[PDB]
Coordinates of C-alpha atoms and ligand atoms in Angstrom, one line a residue:
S1 CA 62.7 76.3 61.1
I2 CA 59.9 76.7 58.8
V3 CA 59.5 75.8 55.0
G4 CA 56.1 75.0 55.6
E5 CA 55.2 78.8 55.1
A6 CA 57.3 78.9 51.8
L7 CA 55.3 75.7 50.6
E8 CA 52.1 77.5 51.5
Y9 CA 53.2 80.4 49.2
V10 CA 53.9 77.8 46.8
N11 CA 50.4 76.9 46.6
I12 CA 49.5 80.7 46.7
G13 CA 51.4 81.7 43.8
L14 CA 49.9 78.8 42.0
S15 CA 46.5 80.1 42.4
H16 CA 47.3 83.6 41.8
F17 CA 48.8 82.3 38.5
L18 CA 45.8 80.7 37.2
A19 CA 44.0 83.8 38.1
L20 CA 46.2 86.1 35.7
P21 CA 44.1 88.1 33.0
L22 CA 44.2 86.2 29.8
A23 CA 46.4 88.7 28.1
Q24 CA 49.4 87.7 30.8
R25 CA 48.4 83.7 30.1
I26 CA 49.0 84.0 26.5
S27 CA 52.1 85.8 27.4
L28 CA 53.5 83.3 29.6
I29 CA 52.1 80.7 27.4
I30 CA 55.1 82.0 24.7
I31 CA 57.4 83.4 27.2
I32 CA 57.9 80.2 29.5
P33 CA 58.4 77.8 26.4
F34 CA 60.8 80.4 24.8
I35 CA 62.8 80.8 28.1
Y36 CA 63.1 77.1 28.9
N37 CA 64.1 76.2 25.5
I38 CA 67.0 78.8 25.7
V39 CA 68.2 77.2 29.0
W40 CA 68.1 73.9 27.8
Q41 CA 70.3 74.8 25.1
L42 CA 72.8 76.1 27.3
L43 CA 72.6 73.0 29.7
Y44 CA 72.8 70.8 26.6
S45 CA 76.2 72.4 25.7
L46 CA 77.7 71.3 28.7
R47 CA 77.4 67.7 28.0
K48 CA 80.4 65.8 26.5
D49 CA 78.6 62.8 24.8
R50 CA 76.6 65.0 22.4
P51 CA 77.8 66.8 19.4
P52 CA 77.4 70.6 19.4
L53 CA 73.7 71.2 18.9
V54 CA 73.1 74.5 16.2
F55 CA 71.5 77.3 18.6
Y56 CA 67.9 78.2 17.5
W57 CA 65.3 80.8 18.8
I58 CA 62.1 79.1 18.1
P59 CA 61.2 76.0 19.8
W60 CA 59.8 73.0 17.7
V61 CA 60.8 75.1 14.8
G62 CA 64.8 74.7 15.3
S63 CA 66.8 75.5 12.1
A64 CA 64.0 74.5 9.8
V65 CA 64.1 77.8 7.8
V66 CA 67.6 78.1 7.1
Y67 CA 68.1 74.6 6.6
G68 CA 65.0 74.3 4.2
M69 CA 66.2 76.9 2.0
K70 CA 69.9 76.7 1.9
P71 CA 71.2 73.4 3.5
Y72 CA 74.6 73.4 2.1
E73 CA 75.2 77.2 3.3
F74 CA 73.6 76.0 6.6
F75 CA 76.0 72.7 6.6
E76 CA 79.2 75.0 5.4
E77 CA 78.4 77.7 8.5
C78 CA 78.0 74.9 11.0
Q79 CA 81.2 73.4 9.6
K80 CA 83.1 76.0 10.3
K81 CA 81.9 76.7 13.8
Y82 CA 81.4 73.0 15.0
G83 CA 83.6 71.1 12.6
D84 CA 82.0 67.8 10.9
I85 CA 79.6 66.2 13.3
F86 CA 77.0 68.7 14.4
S87 CA 73.2 68.5 15.5
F88 CA 70.1 70.9 14.9
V89 CA 66.4 71.1 15.8
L90 CA 64.0 70.5 12.6
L91 CA 60.3 70.7 13.0
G92 CA 60.2 68.7 16.5
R93 CA 63.3 66.3 15.4
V94 CA 66.7 66.5 16.2
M95 CA 69.0 65.7 13.0
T96 CA 72.5 64.5 13.6
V97 CA 74.7 65.6 10.7
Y98 CA 77.8 63.8 9.9
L99 CA 79.8 65.8 7.3
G100 CA 82.0 64.0 4.6
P101 CA 83.3 60.6 3.7
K102 CA 83.3 59.7 7.4
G103 CA 79.6 60.5 8.0
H104 CA 78.8 58.5 4.6
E105 CA 80.4 55.7 6.3
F106 CA 78.9 56.1 9.8
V107 CA 75.2 56.6 8.1
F108 CA 75.2 54.3 5.0
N109 CA 76.9 51.5 6.4
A110 CA 75.2 51.6 9.7
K111 CA 74.1 48.3 11.3
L112 CA 70.7 47.3 10.3
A113 CA 69.8 47.3 14.1
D114 CA 71.1 50.9 14.8
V115 CA 69.0 52.9 12.1
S116 CA 65.8 52.9 10.4
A117 CA 65.5 54.4 6.7
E118 CA 61.6 53.4 6.5
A119 CA 60.9 55.2 10.0
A120 CA 62.2 57.9 8.6
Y121 CA 60.7 57.9 5.2
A122 CA 57.4 55.9 5.3
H123 CA 55.3 59.2 5.7
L124 CA 56.5 60.5 2.9
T125 CA 56.1 57.7 0.1
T126 CA 53.5 55.6 1.5
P127 CA 50.7 57.6 0.9
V128 CA 51.9 58.5 -2.6
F129 CA 53.0 54.9 -3.5
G130 CA 50.5 52.4 -1.7
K131 CA 50.9 50.2 0.8
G132 CA 52.9 47.0 1.7
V133 CA 56.1 48.1 -0.3
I134 CA 59.4 50.5 -0.4
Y135 CA 59.0 51.7 3.2
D136 CA 55.8 50.4 4.2
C137 CA 57.4 46.9 5.0
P138 CA 60.1 45.4 6.9
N139 CA 63.9 46.1 5.3
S140 CA 64.0 42.4 4.6
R141 CA 60.9 43.0 2.2
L142 CA 62.5 46.0 0.5
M143 CA 65.9 44.1 0.0
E144 CA 64.0 41.5 -2.1
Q145 CA 61.9 44.4 -3.7
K146 CA 64.9 45.7 -5.0
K147 CA 66.3 42.5 -6.3
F148 CA 63.0 41.9 -8.1
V149 CA 63.1 45.3 -10.1
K150 CA 66.8 45.0 -10.6
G151 CA 66.0 42.0 -12.4
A152 CA 64.4 43.7 -15.1
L153 CA 67.1 46.3 -15.2
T154 CA 69.6 43.9 -17.2
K155 CA 72.3 44.7 -20.1
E156 CA 69.7 43.0 -22.2
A157 CA 66.7 45.1 -21.2
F158 CA 68.6 48.3 -21.9
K159 CA 69.7 47.2 -25.3
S160 CA 66.0 46.7 -25.7
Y161 CA 65.1 49.9 -24.0
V162 CA 67.8 52.1 -25.9
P163 CA 65.5 52.2 -29.3
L164 CA 62.2 52.9 -27.4
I165 CA 63.8 55.9 -25.7
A166 CA 65.2 57.0 -29.0
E167 CA 61.7 56.5 -30.4
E168 CA 60.2 58.7 -27.7
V169 CA 62.3 61.3 -28.0
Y170 CA 62.2 62.0 -31.5
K171 CA 58.2 61.7 -31.3
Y172 CA 58.4 64.5 -28.4
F173 CA 60.8 66.5 -30.8
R174 CA 58.2 66.0 -33.7
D175 CA 55.1 66.2 -31.6
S176 CA 55.3 68.8 -28.7
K177 CA 54.3 72.1 -28.9
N178 CA 57.7 73.1 -27.1
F179 CA 59.7 72.1 -30.2
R180 CA 57.6 70.8 -33.5
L181 CA 60.9 70.6 -35.6
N182 CA 59.2 69.7 -38.8
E183 CA 57.5 73.2 -38.4
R184 CA 60.2 74.9 -36.7
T185 CA 63.9 75.7 -36.9
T186 CA 64.3 77.4 -33.4
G187 CA 62.3 78.4 -30.4
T188 CA 62.4 79.0 -26.6
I189 CA 61.8 76.2 -23.9
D190 CA 61.6 75.9 -20.2
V191 CA 63.5 73.1 -19.2
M192 CA 61.1 72.5 -15.9
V193 CA 58.5 71.8 -18.3
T194 CA 60.2 69.7 -21.3
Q195 CA 62.5 67.4 -19.0
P196 CA 59.5 66.0 -16.7
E197 CA 57.5 65.3 -19.7
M198 CA 60.4 63.8 -21.6
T199 CA 61.2 61.9 -18.7
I200 CA 57.8 60.3 -18.2
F201 CA 57.3 59.3 -21.5
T202 CA 60.7 57.6 -22.2
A203 CA 60.7 55.8 -18.8
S204 CA 56.8 54.9 -19.1
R205 CA 57.3 53.6 -22.9
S206 CA 60.6 51.4 -21.4
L207 CA 59.6 50.0 -18.1
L208 CA 55.8 49.9 -17.9
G209 CA 55.1 49.3 -21.7
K210 CA 53.3 50.8 -24.7
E211 CA 49.9 50.5 -23.1
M212 CA 51.1 52.6 -20.1
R213 CA 52.7 55.0 -22.6
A214 CA 49.4 55.2 -24.6
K215 CA 47.4 56.1 -21.5
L216 CA 49.7 59.3 -21.0
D217 CA 48.3 60.5 -24.7
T218 CA 45.0 60.9 -22.3
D219 CA 43.4 62.7 -19.7
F220 CA 45.0 59.7 -17.4
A221 CA 48.0 61.9 -17.8
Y222 CA 46.6 64.6 -15.3
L223 CA 46.4 61.7 -12.5
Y224 CA 50.2 61.6 -12.6
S225 CA 50.3 65.5 -12.2
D226 CA 48.1 65.1 -8.8
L227 CA 50.2 61.9 -7.8
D228 CA 53.2 64.0 -8.3
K229 CA 51.9 66.9 -6.3
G230 CA 51.2 64.6 -3.2
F231 CA 55.1 63.7 -3.4
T232 CA 56.3 66.9 -1.4
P233 CA 58.3 67.7 1.8
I234 CA 55.1 68.9 3.5
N235 CA 54.0 65.2 3.7
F236 CA 57.1 65.1 6.7
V237 CA 55.2 67.5 8.8
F238 CA 51.6 67.3 7.7
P239 CA 51.2 63.5 6.0
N240 CA 47.6 63.6 6.3
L241 CA 45.6 66.9 6.9
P242 CA 41.9 66.7 5.2
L243 CA 42.7 69.4 2.7
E244 CA 41.7 68.6 -1.3
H245 CA 45.7 68.4 -2.5
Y246 CA 45.7 65.2 -0.7
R247 CA 42.6 63.7 -1.7
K248 CA 43.3 64.3 -5.7
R249 CA 47.0 62.4 -4.5
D250 CA 44.8 59.3 -2.7
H251 CA 42.5 59.0 -5.8
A252 CA 45.6 59.4 -8.4
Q253 CA 46.9 56.3 -6.4
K254 CA 44.0 54.1 -6.3
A255 CA 43.3 55.2 -10.3
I256 CA 47.2 54.6 -11.3
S257 CA 47.5 51.3 -9.1
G258 CA 43.9 50.4 -10.7
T259 CA 45.2 50.8 -14.2
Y260 CA 48.6 48.8 -13.5
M261 CA 46.5 45.9 -11.7
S262 CA 44.2 45.9 -14.8
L263 CA 46.9 45.4 -17.1
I264 CA 48.6 42.8 -15.1
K265 CA 45.5 40.8 -14.8
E266 CA 44.6 41.0 -18.6
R267 CA 48.4 39.8 -19.1
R268 CA 47.7 36.6 -16.8
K269 CA 44.2 36.0 -17.8
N270 CA 45.6 35.8 -21.8
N271 CA 49.0 34.1 -20.7
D272 CA 50.4 37.1 -22.1
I273 CA 53.6 37.3 -20.3
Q274 CA 57.1 37.8 -22.0
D275 CA 60.1 39.6 -21.3
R276 CA 58.9 43.4 -22.8
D277 CA 59.2 45.5 -19.3
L278 CA 59.2 45.9 -15.7
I279 CA 55.3 44.7 -15.6
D280 CA 56.3 41.3 -17.2
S281 CA 59.4 40.9 -14.9
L282 CA 57.5 41.3 -11.6
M283 CA 54.7 39.3 -12.8
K284 CA 57.2 36.6 -13.2
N285 CA 59.4 37.5 -10.5
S286 CA 58.0 38.7 -7.2
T287 CA 57.9 35.7 -4.7
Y288 CA 59.6 36.6 -1.5
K289 CA 62.2 33.8 -0.2
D290 CA 59.3 32.9 2.4
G291 CA 57.4 32.0 -0.3
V292 CA 54.9 34.8 0.0
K293 CA 53.9 36.4 -3.4
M294 CA 53.7 40.1 -3.8
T295 CA 49.8 41.0 -4.3
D296 CA 49.0 42.7 -7.6
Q297 CA 48.2 45.7 -5.3
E298 CA 51.7 45.7 -4.3
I299 CA 53.3 45.0 -7.5
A300 CA 51.3 48.0 -8.6
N301 CA 52.5 50.0 -6.0
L302 CA 56.2 49.0 -6.3
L303 CA 55.8 50.2 -10.1
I304 CA 54.5 53.4 -8.8
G305 CA 57.5 54.0 -6.4
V306 CA 60.1 52.9 -8.9
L307 CA 58.6 55.1 -11.7
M308 CA 58.2 58.1 -9.4
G309 CA 61.4 58.2 -7.7
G310 CA 63.4 57.8 -11.1
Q311 CA 60.9 60.4 -12.4
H312 CA 62.7 63.3 -10.3
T313 CA 66.0 62.3 -10.4
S314 CA 66.1 62.0 -13.5
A315 CA 64.3 65.1 -14.9
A316 CA 66.0 67.2 -12.7
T317 CA 69.4 65.8 -14.1
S318 CA 68.6 66.5 -17.5
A319 CA 67.2 69.8 -17.1
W320 CA 70.7 70.5 -15.2
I321 CA 72.4 68.9 -18.1
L322 CA 70.8 71.4 -20.7
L323 CA 71.1 74.2 -18.3
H324 CA 75.1 73.9 -17.9
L325 CA 75.7 73.2 -21.6
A326 CA 73.8 76.2 -22.7
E327 CA 76.6 78.4 -21.7
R328 CA 79.2 75.8 -22.8
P329 CA 78.8 75.8 -26.5
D330 CA 82.5 74.3 -26.5
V331 CA 81.2 71.2 -24.7
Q332 CA 78.5 70.8 -27.0
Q333 CA 80.8 70.9 -29.9
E334 CA 83.0 68.3 -28.3
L335 CA 80.3 66.1 -27.2
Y336 CA 79.0 66.5 -31.2
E337 CA 82.6 65.3 -32.4
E338 CA 82.1 62.4 -30.1
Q339 CA 78.6 61.5 -31.4
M340 CA 80.2 61.7 -35.0
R341 CA 83.1 59.4 -34.7
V342 CA 81.3 56.8 -32.5
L343 CA 77.8 56.6 -34.9
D344 CA 80.1 57.0 -37.9
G345 CA 78.7 60.3 -38.9
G346 CA 75.2 59.3 -37.7
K347 CA 75.1 56.3 -40.2
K348 CA 75.2 53.7 -37.3
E349 CA 72.0 53.6 -35.1
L350 CA 72.4 54.1 -31.6
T351 CA 72.8 51.0 -29.3
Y352 CA 73.5 50.6 -25.6
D353 CA 76.8 49.3 -26.4
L354 CA 77.7 52.4 -28.6
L355 CA 76.3 54.5 -25.8
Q356 CA 79.4 52.9 -23.6
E357 CA 81.6 54.0 -26.2
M358 CA 80.5 57.5 -25.3
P359 CA 83.0 58.7 -22.6
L360 CA 82.2 62.5 -22.8
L361 CA 78.7 61.9 -22.9
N362 CA 78.8 59.8 -19.7
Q363 CA 81.3 62.3 -18.0
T364 CA 79.0 65.1 -18.4
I365 CA 76.3 62.9 -16.7
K366 CA 78.6 62.3 -14.3
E367 CA 79.7 65.8 -13.7
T368 CA 76.4 67.3 -13.7
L369 CA 75.2 64.7 -10.8
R370 CA 78.5 66.2 -9.2
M371 CA 77.5 69.5 -9.2
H372 CA 73.7 68.8 -8.6
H373 CA 72.9 65.6 -6.4
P374 CA 69.3 65.5 -6.5
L375 CA 68.8 64.6 -3.3
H376 CA 70.9 67.2 -0.7
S377 CA 70.0 65.1 2.4
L378 CA 69.5 61.0 3.0
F379 CA 68.0 60.1 6.4
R380 CA 67.9 57.7 9.2
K381 CA 66.1 57.5 12.3
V382 CA 68.5 56.2 15.1
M383 CA 67.0 53.0 16.7
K384 CA 69.7 52.3 19.0
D385 CA 72.1 54.8 20.8
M386 CA 75.3 54.9 18.6
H387 CA 78.6 55.8 19.7
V388 CA 80.6 58.0 16.9
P389 CA 84.1 56.5 16.9
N390 CA 87.2 58.3 17.9
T391 CA 84.9 60.7 19.9
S392 CA 82.9 60.6 23.0
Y393 CA 79.8 61.3 21.1
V394 CA 76.9 59.4 21.7
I395 CA 73.7 59.6 19.3
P396 CA 70.6 58.5 21.3
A397 CA 68.2 56.6 20.0
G398 CA 65.1 59.0 19.0
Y399 CA 67.7 61.0 17.2
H400 CA 67.7 61.1 13.1
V401 CA 71.0 60.9 11.5
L402 CA 71.6 62.8 8.3
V403 CA 74.2 62.4 5.5
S404 CA 74.9 64.8 2.7
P405 CA 77.3 63.4 -0.1
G406 CA 76.1 66.2 -2.1
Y407 CA 77.5 68.7 -0.1
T408 CA 81.3 66.9 -0.1
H409 CA 80.6 66.8 -4.1
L410 CA 81.0 70.8 -3.9
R411 CA 84.1 70.8 -1.5
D412 CA 87.2 72.0 -3.4
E413 CA 89.3 69.5 -0.8
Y414 CA 87.9 66.5 -2.7
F415 CA 87.5 68.3 -6.0
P416 CA 89.5 71.2 -7.1
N417 CA 87.7 74.2 -8.3
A418 CA 84.4 72.5 -7.4
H419 CA 82.1 75.3 -8.6
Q420 CA 83.4 74.7 -11.9
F421 CA 81.4 72.9 -14.5
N422 CA 84.4 70.4 -16.0
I423 CA 83.6 67.2 -17.4
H424 CA 87.3 66.6 -18.2
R425 CA 87.9 65.9 -14.3
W426 CA 86.6 62.6 -14.9
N427 CA 88.8 61.8 -17.9
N428 CA 89.5 58.2 -18.2
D429 CA 87.0 58.1 -15.5
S430 CA 83.6 57.8 -17.0
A431 CA 81.9 55.3 -15.1
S432 CA 78.7 56.2 -13.1
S433 CA 80.3 54.9 -10.1
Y434 CA 83.0 52.5 -9.3
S435 CA 83.5 50.1 -6.3
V436 CA 87.7 50.5 -5.2
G437 CA 87.8 47.2 -3.4
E438 CA 85.8 44.4 -1.5
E439 CA 81.9 43.8 -2.2
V440 CA 79.0 42.9 -0.2
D441 CA 75.4 42.0 -1.0
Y442 CA 72.5 43.0 1.0
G443 CA 70.1 41.0 -0.9
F444 CA 69.6 42.7 -4.3
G445 CA 73.1 42.1 -5.7
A446 CA 76.9 42.5 -4.8
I447 CA 77.5 46.5 -4.4
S448 CA 80.7 48.3 -2.8
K449 CA 81.4 47.1 0.9
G450 CA 82.8 50.5 1.5
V451 CA 80.9 53.8 1.2
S452 CA 84.0 56.2 1.8
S453 CA 84.1 57.4 -1.8
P454 CA 84.0 61.4 -2.0
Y455 CA 81.7 61.1 -5.1
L456 CA 78.6 59.0 -4.0
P457 CA 75.9 60.4 -6.1
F458 CA 73.9 56.7 -5.4
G459 CA 74.5 56.7 -1.8
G460 CA 75.8 53.2 -0.6
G461 CA 75.1 50.3 2.0
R462 CA 71.8 48.7 1.9
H463 CA 69.6 51.5 0.7
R464 CA 71.9 52.0 -2.2
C465 CA 70.2 53.0 -5.6
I466 CA 69.3 50.3 -8.0
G467 CA 68.2 52.7 -10.8
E468 CA 71.8 54.2 -11.6
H469 CA 72.3 52.3 -14.7
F470 CA 68.8 52.9 -16.1
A471 CA 69.4 56.6 -15.4
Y472 CA 72.5 56.5 -17.6
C473 CA 71.0 54.6 -20.4
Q474 CA 67.8 57.1 -20.2
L475 CA 70.1 60.5 -19.8
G476 CA 72.6 58.9 -22.1
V477 CA 69.7 58.1 -25.2
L478 CA 67.9 61.5 -24.4
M479 CA 71.5 63.6 -24.3
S480 CA 72.9 61.8 -27.4
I481 CA 69.7 62.9 -29.3
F482 CA 69.9 66.4 -28.3
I483 CA 73.4 67.1 -29.2
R484 CA 72.8 65.2 -32.5
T485 CA 69.8 67.2 -33.4
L486 CA 70.1 70.8 -31.7
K487 CA 72.3 73.5 -30.3
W488 CA 71.3 75.8 -27.5
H489 CA 72.1 78.6 -25.8
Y490 CA 70.5 81.3 -23.0
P491 CA 68.7 84.2 -23.6
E492 CA 70.6 87.8 -23.3
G493 CA 72.3 87.9 -19.8
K494 CA 70.8 84.6 -18.3
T495 CA 72.9 82.0 -17.0
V496 CA 72.6 78.7 -14.8
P497 CA 69.7 79.1 -12.4
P498 CA 70.6 78.6 -8.7
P499 CA 68.9 75.6 -7.2
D500 CA 65.6 75.2 -5.4
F501 CA 66.4 73.2 -2.5
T502 CA 62.7 73.3 -1.1
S503 CA 61.3 70.8 -3.6
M504 CA 61.2 67.1 -3.3
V505 CA 64.8 67.2 -5.3
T506 CA 66.8 69.6 -5.8
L507 CA 65.7 71.5 -9.1
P508 CA 66.8 74.3 -10.9
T509 CA 64.8 77.7 -9.9
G510 CA 62.5 78.4 -12.9
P511 CA 61.2 79.4 -15.3
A512 CA 64.9 78.2 -16.8
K513 CA 64.7 78.9 -20.4
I514 CA 66.9 78.1 -23.2
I515 CA 66.7 78.6 -26.6
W516 CA 67.4 76.0 -29.2
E517 CA 68.2 75.8 -32.8
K518 CA 67.8 72.8 -35.4
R519 CA 71.6 71.8 -36.6
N520 CA 70.0 70.8 -39.6
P521 CA 67.0 73.0 -40.3
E522 CA 66.0 70.8 -43.4
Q523 CA 65.9 67.5 -41.1
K524 CA 62.5 65.9 -41.0
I525 CA 61.3 63.3 -38.2
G526 CA 59.1 60.6 -40.1
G527 CA 56.1 59.0 -38.7
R528 CA 52.5 59.6 -38.4
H529 CA 51.1 62.6 -36.4
Ligands
HEM1 C1 70.2 60.6 -11.6 C2 69.5 59.6 -11.2 C3 69.5 59.4 -9.6 C4 70.3 59.3 -8.5 C5 71.3 60.7 -8.1 C6 69.7 58.6 -7.3 C7 70.1 58.7 -6.0 C8 70.0 57.9 -5.3 C9 70.4 57.7 -3.8 C10 71.3 58.6 -3.3 C11 69.6 56.7 -3.3 C12 69.9 56.3 -1.7 C13 68.9 56.8 -0.8 C14 69.2 56.9 0.7 O1 70.3 56.1 1.3 O2 68.0 57.1 1.5 C15 69.0 56.0 -4.2 C16 68.0 54.6 -4.0 C17 67.1 54.4 -4.7 N1 67.0 55.0 -5.9 FE1 67.9 55.9 -7.0 N2 68.6 57.7 -7.8 C18 68.6 58.0 -9.2 C19 67.8 57.3 -10.3 C20 67.0 56.5 -9.8 C21 66.0 55.6 -10.9 C22 66.0 55.9 -12.2 C23 65.5 54.6 -10.1 C24 64.2 53.7 -10.7 C25 64.2 53.5 -12.2 C26 65.8 54.8 -8.7 C27 65.5 53.8 -7.7 C28 65.7 53.7 -6.6 C29 65.5 52.8 -5.3 C30 64.6 51.7 -5.8 C31 66.3 53.1 -4.1 C32 66.2 52.3 -2.9 C33 65.9 52.9 -1.7 C34 66.2 52.2 -0.5 O3 66.9 51.1 -0.4 O4 65.7 52.6 0.6 N3 66.8 55.7 -8.5 N4 69.0 56.7 -5.2
5L9_2 O1 65.3 57.9 -2.3 C1 63.8 58.3 -2.6 C2 63.2 59.0 -1.4 C3 63.9 60.2 -1.0 C4 65.0 60.1 -0.2 C5 65.6 61.5 0.3 C6 65.4 62.8 -0.3 C7 64.1 62.8 -1.1 C8 63.4 61.6 -1.4 CL1 62.1 61.4 -2.6 C9 64.0 59.3 -3.8 N1 64.8 58.5 -4.8 C10 66.0 58.1 -5.0 N2 66.4 57.4 -6.2 C11 64.9 57.8 -7.1 N3 64.1 58.3 -5.9 C12 63.1 57.0 -3.2 CL2 61.7 57.4 -3.9 C13 63.0 55.7 -2.2 C14 63.9 55.9 -3.5

């Protein structure tokens, strides 16, 4: 009765292992984790308290490639095989996806102690925006920062922003090489060139003020480009590897936040604090409820985060609006008639109030956001084991949950003929979003308590967007002027481009070109240039 002999051979086998030729160790270096990964999944599949896990060949990497390149096609296939709740491995992480409205509820309305946004996102945003704000701070601090920013995003502020945004659009039509409407009556543009520029010019002028706008006419503008490059999914995996891309980013954040702090300190020095912009607003209103004041640095960092977030979602969206309308001269025509009726043939100056009397224009924004949600996936890190209602599934702490309202936007069950661009599906329902019942306030205003709406472009719950009305104002003004000034169409045999899902938002694959022409060839834009 000797297992002793077998124990000796374990030890012997171990020493013979360590003495294998390098070619075989390297081999086993790869064979043993590859094999282990596969038997681990098979064992995992037997667990009744876990959602089904998408099978993958490469350890650590997981389904990263197919998810990264075609997330909605990935979800649809998984949904057919497994149903609405399933997990997949992503660059060392386990992601649990809950599709559909119940998914929205599970994640967006999750208890504060159950999940963490900042633990999922801080590595992406903190290097770009700076310390102490958004996700580099406790949730309670984020809630109040959202309250401070929302305090400058009032109806009165929008009434004052509309003519400023309009001035910037007209200036861009007058001065930009992409247009020059006083010199040229037709031309070709890449919308992924023009919309980022139009977006930063309009958002700078209105949210940051004339000083910060004026700086964009200089070499300073290049820092925004640099800071922009740092805003990339690569930050999720390699947040800080010592390359030049990362240094240009870090430098830009310092230079840009330094510029904002210079203005802030100048205004306080001169008692020059009015109600012009978001800077005036945060200077007057940025004291937390425990009495700590945001620092000038944190105020500047919060300005960067707000401008940068709004930059990418808005620019992507007006690009998509232009691209869907380029093959729909019927929609351009209908929008143009609305412009003529609401603005008395163009005799009335556009105001924020008249924007609210443009339902087809607003429905066009609404429908573009349905077909092209800028953020295909939203994430939380699971902090406490979560039971999935009406199942035996438990999502353990350390997992991440993923929700995708943009996926549901594209399902025929909730939006008939979902892959058809049709602004009239929103007839008599042109509001950017609408709360169908009870409300709750997490610290930045009363918002919808339920988050089961199949249309959820602005998310929901404590992390819900506060930029929605600014975006509609900005997009509204911009598109109102595009429509009254130009017609546009595709180059021969071109059509709406497929989305690029790998960038930070779901951009059109470029170059995405349209041909514009002036509705009034002789019309001139005044002002000095
Ligand atoms: C078409 C335009 C936009 C869309 C579709 C959009 C979408 C969203 C979504 C889905 C969220 C929820 C994020 C999550 O749950 O993880 C969000 C949050 C947020 N957005 Fe927007 N957004 C847009 C424009 C803007 C603009 C213009 C601003 C600022 C001016 C802005 C600022 C914010 C802020 C501060 C949050 C809160 C993040 C948090 O609490 O964790 N967004 N947005
Ligand atoms: O939600 C964000 C972050 C985010 C979340 C999910 C996917 C991509 C990004 Cl960039 C993106 N965004 C949402 N609205 C405006 N920007 C921030 Cl920057 C916090 C607000």
